[PDB]
Structure 1
Amino acid sequence: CGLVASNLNLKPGECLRVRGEVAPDAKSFVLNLGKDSNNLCLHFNPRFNAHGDANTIVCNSKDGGAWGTEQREAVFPFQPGSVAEVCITFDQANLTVKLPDGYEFKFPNRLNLEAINYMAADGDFKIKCVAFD
Structure 2
Amino acid sequence: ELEVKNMDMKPGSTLKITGSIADGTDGFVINLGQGTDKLNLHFNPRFSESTIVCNSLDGSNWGQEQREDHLCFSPGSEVKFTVTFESDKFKVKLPDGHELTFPNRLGHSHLSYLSVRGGFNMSSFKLKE
TM-score normalised according to structure 1 size:
0.91
Match of 2:55 among 39, 56, 60: 60
The residue number in structure 1 matching 2:83 is 88
The residue number in structure 2 matching 1:98 is 93
* Residue identity matched to 1:34: G
The residue number in structure 1 matching 2:38 is 39
The residue number in structure 2 matching 1:79 is 74
Contact 1:26 1:81 survives alignment (8 Å): no
- Shift in Å, 1:100: 4.6
* Residue identity matched to 2:109: E
| Cα distance in 1 for residues equivalent to 2:91 and 2:31 | 13
| Cα distance in 2 for residues equivalent to 1:121 and 1:33 | 9
The structure in which a higher percent of residues are strand is 1
TM-score normalised according to structure 2 size:
0.94
* Superposition RMSD in Å: 1.1
Structure 1 gaps of 5+ residues are: none
* Residue identity matched to 1:113: H
Q: For each residue in 1:8-66, what CA deviation from the matched residue of structure 2 results, as whole angstroms up to 9, or x when unmatched?
A: 110011011100000111111000000000001100000001xxx2x210000001332
| Cα distance in 2 for residues equivalent to 1:43 and 1:100 | 17
* Residue identity matched to 2:63: G
* Residue identity matched to 2:23: P
